[PDB]
Swiss-Prot record:
Keywords, comma-separated and alphabetical: Calcium, Collagen degradation, Extracellular matrix, Hydrolase, Metal-binding, Metalloprotease, Protease, Secreted, Signal, Zinc, Zymogen
Source organism: Homo sapiens
Active site: 195
GO molecular function: endopeptidase activity; metalloendopeptidase activity; metallopeptidase activity; serine-type endopeptidase activity; zinc ion binding
Catalytic activity: Cleavage of 14-Ala-|-Leu-15 and 16-Tyr-|-Leu-17 in B chain of insulin. No action on collagen types I, II, IV, V. Cleaves gelatin chain alpha2(I) > alpha1(I)
Record protein name field: Matrilysin
Amino acids binding Ca(2+) 2: 150-151, 153, 155, 173, 176
List of residues binding Zn(2+) 2: 67, 194, 198, 204
Cofactors: Ca(2+); Zn(2+)
EC number(s) reported in the record: 3.4.24.23
Binding residues for Zn(2+) 1: 143, 145, 158, 171
Amino acid sequence: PQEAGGMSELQWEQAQDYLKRFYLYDSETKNANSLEAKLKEMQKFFGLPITGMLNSRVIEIMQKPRCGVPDVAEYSLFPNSPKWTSKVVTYRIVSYTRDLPHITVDRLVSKALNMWGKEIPLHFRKVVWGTADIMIGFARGAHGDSYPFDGPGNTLAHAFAPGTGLGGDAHFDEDERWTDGSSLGINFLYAATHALGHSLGMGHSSDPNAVMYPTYGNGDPQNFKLSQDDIKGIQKLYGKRSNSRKK
Ligand SMILES: [Ca+2]
Ligand SMILES: [Ca+2]
Ligand SMILES: [Zn+2]
Ligand SMILES: [Zn+2]
């Protein structure tokens, strides 16, 4: 439809900002010409082939929601290996959103987290007494951590890397819409694979059928399943695999 033709400067400029936050709001990449190189890495990060452009898929994704985890990091004392080295992983829900009953949130977090575990020799464990590694809560950036709330729209959910006992948690922007049967806003199952995937130190992928595919296409999946590219992606680190194997 060529909607970009009738867009204003404000829209094109907004794009600069929407992506600026996707990799931390750092003035180090603040220059007119850098736009070209800086979109170059965005376009490949997503995978979409139109490089050097800002109008077709590239604007669509700026406006569509996706994830709230920056795609960069810079710290020392990093834990053993980027993904969960531990022999086991544990996970517990902190609170639940009114859109969904606790039972539902709980079984979705697990039905995705478990899929991840089912593609690798890692092992997973149920929680019935004590705290866990990955806490799953609903909250706004002003709950008690860095990164602003954003509100609805851009920035879907922040999550943390498997580091320390406190780090590794997954969060859900409570402002965002969260539901399964209704199949209206963001599917918990689908986002859960993504949010929980970051809890395992997994990164985004470029394949059009990826499970952490950042080019979200809206809608809710009926059954949902893991992707080939993510299964091989993770097995390169853990060596052996379980070839998904699910119902
Ligand atoms: Ca949001
Ligand atoms: Ca944790
Ligand atoms: Zn993400
Ligand atoms: Zn937080």
